[PDB]
Amino acid sequence: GSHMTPKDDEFYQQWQLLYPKLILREASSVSEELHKEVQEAFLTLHKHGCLFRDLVRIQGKDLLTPVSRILIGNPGCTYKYLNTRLFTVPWPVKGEAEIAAACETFLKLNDYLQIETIQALEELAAKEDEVDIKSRAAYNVTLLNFMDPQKMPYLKEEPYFGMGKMAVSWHHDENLVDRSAVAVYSYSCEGRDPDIWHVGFKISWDIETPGLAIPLHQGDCYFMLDDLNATHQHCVLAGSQPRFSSTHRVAECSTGTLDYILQRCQLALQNVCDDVDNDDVSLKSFEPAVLKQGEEIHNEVEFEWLRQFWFQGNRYRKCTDWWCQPMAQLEALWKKMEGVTNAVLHEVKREGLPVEQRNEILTAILASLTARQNLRREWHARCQSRIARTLQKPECRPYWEKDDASMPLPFDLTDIVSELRGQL
Ligand SMILES: Cc1n[nH]c(C)c1-c1cc(Cl)c(Nc2ccccc2C(=O)NO)c(Cl)c1
Ligand SMILES: O=C(O)CNC(=O)C(=O)O
């Protein structure tokens, strides 16, 4: 197993024949105006401490990420990677001061890279509607990254091609719009040179075709066009210096915007008599499908939104308070839904209800309350791991003790979920 750099004579033809949807636009092709601003914006965001390592999860194991990142993008948009939902620090489009300046820079960078990507995708088609090109370049977020490699005690070796040290292992960028492009601005402060940063590429499934290691110098950009991200894997090979990147994506956010999740809560609350907001929650229907939907939405807001947000110790507050009202509002909507689950439970215990209507209700809601119990343990335990204790550390929220009648239901549902089974 081997790899090719610009030192190898075969590099230039292997690029053209086995990695042609990869494009490089070097520092020289980007205006000096933009370089200074974009690099000052990285240094700005680093100074204020806006970039954090994430307490991610992979195959059961709780792991801290080598690199430090922040997500910037459209207001209300999220990007999920490695079971962790990141929330946009918003950039200004259609309606704390140094930080708003940096976000606007990365919007300016976003606009530039978009025109470069559309252009590059035109040229790819000429070789091989025009709305498809537009939507596959319509970047809604950028994930900024940072790693000082001298503050890692030992870096993993690249295992298939001898590319040396890896900052990020071989992967695909998850959760992107199908065939969408990715644009990356890179900024560093025998085989491949160990002191220089490279992006590595290989074909999926394949360690026989030699991989490419693309040297990245101060302000070089690369572009993964079309189905590249799916057919190929990439890695980041570490240099000796620290290095930033801004990686612009079209995040598949069909169930990942503030608007989308508010609307889902609005949908669950259609089954609640809504004259007044108090603890007397009563429901319009107990038709199985309506109750199932309500309980599924309760989980969605709790686990995809509330617990994902508060697991990040309010690292967002530091740079922006955009998500503060939204998340208070989502919690209150979730709290009402606790009221709903309580009201459904009340109804199944009613002397008066035919067992036949009771059993049809349980089959509607049990998978949802099952899944609420398991994920509550997973999230609670994940907030309590020895690694998490070491610290703005991860808050388990919402959480409440049994001796607390502000909440209609208990956090531990084992009593409750177990009782509903023995019947059915
Ligand atoms: C998936 C996906 N979608 N979008 C993105 C940004 C990713 C993504 C992000 C990261 Cl940060 C990592 N890396 C690691 C993560 C945890 C621990 C170690 C490493 C590492 O690789 N050290 O060896 C990989 Cl592999 C993928
Ligand atoms: O070059 C980069 O830093 C971008 N690549 C990645 O997979 C990443 O976002 O970590």
From Swiss-Prot:
Cofactor(s) required, per the database record: Fe(2+)
Subcellular location: Nucleus; Nucleus speckle; Cytoplasm
EC number(s) reported in the record: 1.14.11.-, 1.14.11.53
Binding site for 2-oxoglutarate: 145, 222, 243-245, 247, 249
Documented activity regulation: Activated by ascorbate. Inhibited by N-oxalylglycine, fumarate and succinate. RNA N(6)-methyladenosine demethylase activity is inhibited by fluorescein derivatives. RNA N(6)-methyladenosine demethylase activity is selectively inhibited by meclofenamic acid; inhibition is specific to FTO and meclofenamic acid does not inhibit ALKBH5. Specifically inhibited by R-2-hydroxyglutarate (R-2HG), an oncometabolite that also exerts a broad antileukemic activity.
Tissue localization of expression: Ubiquitously expressed, with relatively high expression in adrenal glands and brain; especially in hypothalamus and pituitary. Highly expressed in highly expressed in acute myeloid leukemias (AML) with t(11;11)(q23;23) with KMT2A/MLL1 rearrangements, t(15;17)(q21;q21)/PML-RARA, FLT3-ITD, and/or NPM1 mutations.
A cellular component annotation (GO) from this entry: nuclear speck
BP GO terms, sorted: adipose tissue development; DNA alkylation repair; mRNA destabilization; regulation of brown fat cell differentiation; regulation of lipid storage; regulation of multicellular organism growth; regulation of respiratory system process; regulation of white fat cell proliferation
pH profile of the protein: Optimum pH is 5.5-6.
Region listing for Loop L1, in residue ranges: 153-164
GO molecular function per UniProt: broad specificity oxidative DNA demethylase activity; ferrous iron binding; mRNA N6-methyladenosine dioxygenase activity; oxidative RNA demethylase activity; transferase activity; tRNA demethylase activity
Function: RNA demethylase that mediates oxidative demethylation of different RNA species, such as mRNAs, tRNAs and snRNAs, and acts as a regulator of fat mass, adipogenesis and energy homeostasis. Specifically demethylates N(6)-methyladenosine (m6A) RNA, the most prevalent internal modification of messenger RNA (mRNA) in higher eukaryotes. M6A demethylation by FTO affects mRNA expression and stability. Also able to demethylate m6A in U6 small nuclear RNA (snRNA).
Protein's recorded name: Alpha-ketoglutarate-dependent dioxygenase FTO
